[PDB]
């Protein structure tokens, strides 16, 4: 749908902007597994999605930057949520807490999560327990549409 | 006021105090009877719940959302980075852009607006064409409760 396409672009442009600036980001998209428990660890927003708000949330040294944004349908449910951290040895001891968090939530839920690395600006995603690293902008948009909306 | 109303008041007050200390300019408009939809539509739509954290995040300098007014409708943030009209009054023009904007919206609406000065951290409010400068935290909370929740 047209409105779904608008939302994919909003998220994609935000993720691309943060990747360019090497702004760390962690955004979880709820699917079938209810994430209310993790949402309640963060700051409740129930906010509409925009490129501008997504970027604002993750600006370094701001109250909402640390932790995960969790999106439920067309709304931002919360920011600065605490995800569990994976103990997988596959996660290079080099990789930061955000990656461990993204894999962590993917181990205990069917959520689709995007991570922007603050070191490299690489875009990665997790789902079904596995980190998929350093994907292109075009592939991120394709996977996001698939997992978020099923389009 | 209800406990929930009380919590909202505290959320806004704490955010304003935080920004004041750090000399972060802020401009928050509380809609009353005059509909502000036209101004809301110039901003970035949010329809978000209110927290101290989100209010601070919005006004961080050099972010997309800091450049304009936050407009609140009931218990929700309708929009950020909204345009407000600048006051036409010569006598009022003498102060800066944010304050002239706060006076301006109060001249064409019954809205209640709070401004934090970037220069001094002073808290000021506007209502009914009137500007009240450098008010205490306690007076701010009293006035906000009256205007926001009746």
Numbering used by the authors:
A (entry chain B): 111 to 261
B (entry chain A): 110 to 202, 204 to 260
Q: What did the study's authors say about this model?
A:
In the human pathogen Staphylococcus aureus, c-di-AMP is produced by the di-adenylate cyclase enzyme DacA, which is thought to form a complex and be regulated by YbbR and GlmM, two other conserved proteins. We determined the atomic structures of the S. aureus DacA and GlmM enzymes and show that GlmM readily binds to DacA in vitro and blocks its activity by masking its active site. Specifically, our data suggest that GlmM blocks access to the active site of DacA and in this manner prevents the formation of catalytically active head-to-head DacA oligomers.
The S. aureus DacACD protein displayed the expected globular fold, with a central β-sheet made up of 7 antiparallel strands flanked by 5 helices (left). While the L. monocytogenes CdaACD protein was found to be a tetramer in the asymmetric unit (although dimeric in solution), the S. aureus DacACD was present as a symmetric dimer, with two protomers interacting via the backbone of α3, β2 and the loop connecting α3 and β3. At the interface, residue N166 from one protomer formed a hydrogen bond interaction with residue T172 from the second protomer and a van der Waals interaction was formed between residue P173 and residues N166 and I165 of the neighbouring protomer. Further analysis using the PdbePISA program revealed a total buried surface area of 1450 Å2 at the dimer interface with a ΔG (int) of -8.3 kcal/mol and a ΔG (diss) of 2.1 kcal/mol, indicative of a strong protein/protein interaction. In addition, analysis of the crystal lattice did not reveal any symmetry-related molecule arranged with the catalytic sites in a head-to-head orientation. Here, we show that the S. aureus DacACD protein is a dimer. However, based on the data presented in this study, we suggest that this dimer is not the active unit per se, as the protomers are not found in a head-to-head conformation.
